[PDB]
Write a protein that binds this ligand. Structure first.
Ligand code: ASP
Ligand code: ASP
Ligand code: ASP
Ligand code: ASP
Lengths: 324, 324, 324, 324
């Protein structure tokens, strides 16, 4: 059997409430990894599992300094001969951010599979148990190697690059509308469908193994009447990058243009993404900033932060956005 | 034939470039309403049409003060016996905002149909000509009365309350994933599917006739490492409301909580929405602010601006979010 | 509390296996309604429930003669003052067919809510317990009245007329891509979004309480090299109707045309639907047969079968396909 | 510039009508390939194009004998040093079938791109011109090689193996809900997203060069009261294979089981697929026949027909369904 580490970080998957129908005020923070494992003892027939408690927080509170440590720990685990893959339990709210950070920074072809749940562990028809079992199946299959970092919920295997939480509250929220899933897990069998045509993991230039902090990057929203003062505030607080969740295809109002021009004069890198949820922001030399290709705001922030650890060259950063 | 006013505001539907393949740097601002009409002379068999040029701007520059004037003008038109319906040509980037605003403020059951195009008028396979024909058909049909404000592109009829631009760049971008379309237009026939189960138009409390300005509302994004100082800046600049484009189901970090509590202390109403794109932000009394129900951030800002013209009572605002 | 009858018919929702991971060869037929109810005792806080075993079969084996009895039983139940609504447990494979039959023939505004599960009751993370809770919530809510027949799974409420099983094997399979959900159930709360703009239940002409047999209607697929001899076979076996699951918008090959013409010569009513999954088959006088509007093949067969109990006039049948 | 051959087969892309709004009774058969090319002279900046007229039919009339000749012609063209790629204009109704056939039988890594249109060439906002331009851009790009056969409409690049016509009548009908698109074309730029993880073209065992006919395979629908006599009829008429468009996950009624057992006794290979539109039909040793993995009925028919040119060994055929 393959040797799989289950690295727990918190989330609703490790949430507990006093009744099976409670959806608010459940606690995250007191349910440990061994309790998740013991709730699905069937995982032991798929892998020799070892639980490790990395953190126990609601993912809305996950921070880049912590994600950096998570990436470094995973890289340490995967460098060992006795570890074949890692499953990371996490909250759904920012799993796409953590997963994509690891997607770019893990220097191994061994599987890294993020898993989460929309319903607490105590809920009627809680999704975490099956999601965990699926995640371990994926992480322990030799065919899963070399595919980049994965996010597994609800019988689906999503690439960290494309998958996003699309719905506030449903079980089937993780989707990649235009890019689909890498694979699905049905009837205890994995069906691989796609390989992402982007750079990741062992073919990625990003390396944060020796680093202790990351560039500050903020996200500003685009909408009617959007204010210029938010750009001033960001600049004043020392951002190195701004991701713009733009109207449409990264379209910018007269106020946003003024703000972006100010940020650029101070050396801030501006990436124009979209608030829409999907699709390409195309290049446009008449507008300020670089373009996010098909990276959503949350993903674009992660790529920009990592880009800034190794370059300041806008041509290179723009190429990263087209290739990662 | 029905009498329809085509009230033009700008957008890529009135955009023009020197070649049929140009997708950036096309111009908006020089193509008038009568040129759109004359490009589809078939429209004169569907309705007696009259063009009126309201504005000629890219919709990323549309502002609340202008949308207020647009609502006021549409109400004046619809009050006339010689107007059966109004089609409004608009940019796609913020049509959902303008349309939702009219949805809540137009005091007539006569159809109001926003129309837009993703490709400029000069493009190969431009979508605007057919979109416009479909919009005029929808606006003139008796079956279209009392449906709320509508957004028509790509053979679909979306309710202003549910429809959103879901993709930066595709023809099929307007979708309501969980709510579907009010109807479709196929083979020159309208097929109505649904009537929205929400308050609007003639049953709405909101009335902005005689207002000249609207309460200031900003939108802040939720993400890992989101900063408290953006809430400070908003407060400092006199916002009356903040809509939060939250992680997941309106989930808030420790930093966002601190910012939100500060804002509330200053009398700012906070609405927690979601960055996800879809779904319900459920109530949770322990967290700060009110919840957006299924309203996305852009829609929630419109509803909140209008709510603030009438009340500061959180109970009443929250009920508006569940009913409009 | 409302009074709800849970009328059980079988399905995977009532399926059982000896382990939590078994997805094939689980048994349907030996898990009774009271076993479903006692697995979610929380239901008793939502309603006073009474279980009634109507049948215990896999739904691929459900037949129109049995559906007719189901409809008759539900009408008896809903005519009682001590019954506020009915939840029907059913297999997912043909729930859309049973549900739409009831949608057209139940002569009450009281809620009728079909529920099903994609995982057996014994499965890890089985969906049926929460689905059943949600269905009883919907059936017991006074706001659920007058909506037509509903199908509830995975936190969604679909209209029988629009919902379909879109995926062989996933929890989120039930969707209505173009028409959306009537509502959703999140955080123990119902959010109604739409009302269907079609005739049903108390405004439907179909009444089968005195119906003594059902007309025979077959469905034939359209594809390259489709054979004429299947139409011959259908005609020879006495079908009264054929639903064609056509290529595209009910497009017919030269062979299909020959078959359809033959069928019509013999008095068989032909409806051209689509194999695509969604959308409108528009009228086309140059082709044989009537058109299905937006009814998929399974739904079109149900409506045709009912229509044939009342009329053989193609103009009347065609108008039923545009209004129901 | 690359050398691209446009090989025309017919379809609505080559349809013509007397007015721009006519959606029925337009003619296919009178617009030649040069007329398509001359409608988009911009194409000549993308490629050196040569048109060849293979056929001029509505695709609902396309047959396996003709597709076999199309595949043979494409293989001849791609064997030339002076041909860099081929674009094939085709009707939308059965493009998925012709494309998948070629996906399995073209013995080159040079791009083969099918293109189609939902509106006739004469329509207001006809989609064919831009679709054709996009197809030529894709076929001419060196990065397009080795990707399998592609289907291009509406700014999307779909794999022949996953793409299907999902809606009877809309421009955005071609989708792969679970698998996404191989890429997209926005702003005159190609964005590749995925490589399919299936065998195709140069890695495929199939070579039909030299064959003039194919094994007979019919598709039978699954539904409530489905009849055994359609199985009898197919067997009687000499089918070598039956694809079942099953209820749910290839679920079979007692009548379908009887028919399938009869067919298998006569040496007919039965594949259980799904009518649902998407997803996996899993193995089940208790049911008759092989399973279609995620192949929909139309695609499963093509693979089975090809498989039958080489083998009747169910173990091999089943592996093919999992790998092609
Ligand atoms: N707030 C939780 C939500 C979840 O995990 O479903 C988290 O992200 O930690
Ligand atoms: N920026 C344009 C985009 C469009 O109309 O498609 C607008 O919103 O005015
Ligand atoms: N064959 C089962 C499938 C399910 O219920 O999910 C049924 O329809 O009865
Ligand atoms: N019947 C046409 C439809 C189209 O091309 O859109 C065809 O498949 O040839």
């Amino acid at each position: 059997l393959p040797n799989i580490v289950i690295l727990a970080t918190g989330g609703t998957i490790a949430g507990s409430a006093a009744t099976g129908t409670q959806t608010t005020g459940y606690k995250i923070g007191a349910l440990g990894v061994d309790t998740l494992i013991n709730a699905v003892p069937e995982v032991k027939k798929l892998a020799n599992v070892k639980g490790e408690q990395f953190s126990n927080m609601a993912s809305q509170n996950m921070t880049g300094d912590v994600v950096l440590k998570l990436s470094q720990r995973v890289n340490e685990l995967l460098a060992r001969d006795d570890v074949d893959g890692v499953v990371i339990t996490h909250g759904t709210d920012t799993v796409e951010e953590s997963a994509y950070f690891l997607h770019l920074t893990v220097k191994s072809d061994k599987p890294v599979v993020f898993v989460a749940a929309m319903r607490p562990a105590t809920a009627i028809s809680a999704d975490g148990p099956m999601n965990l079992l699926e995640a371990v199946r994926v992480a322990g299959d030799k065919q899963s190697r070399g595919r980049g970092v994965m996010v597994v919920l609800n019988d689906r295997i999503g690439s960290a690059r494309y998958i996003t939480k699309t719905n506030a509250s449903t079980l089937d929220t993780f989707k990649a509308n235009e890019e689909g899933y890498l694979g699905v897990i049905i009837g205890n069998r994995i069906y691989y469908q796609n390989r992402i045509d982007k750079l990741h993991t062992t073919r990625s230039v990003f390396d944060v193994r020796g680093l202790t902090s990351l560039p500050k990057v903020d996200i500003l929203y685009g909408y009617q009447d959007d204010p210029e003062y938010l750009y001033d505030a960001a600049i004043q607080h020392g951002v190195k990058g701004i991701v713009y969740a733009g109207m449409g295809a990264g379209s910018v109002s007269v106020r946003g243009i003024a703000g972006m021009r100010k940020a650029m004069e101070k050396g801030v890198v501006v990436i124009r993404s979209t608030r829409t949820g999907n699709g390409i922001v195309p290049p446009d030399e008449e507008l300020p900033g670089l373009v996010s290709d098909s990276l959503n705001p949350a993903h674009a922030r992660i790529l920009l932060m990592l880009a800034l650890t190794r370059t300041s060259d806008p041509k290179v950063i723009q190429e990263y956005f087209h290739t990662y």
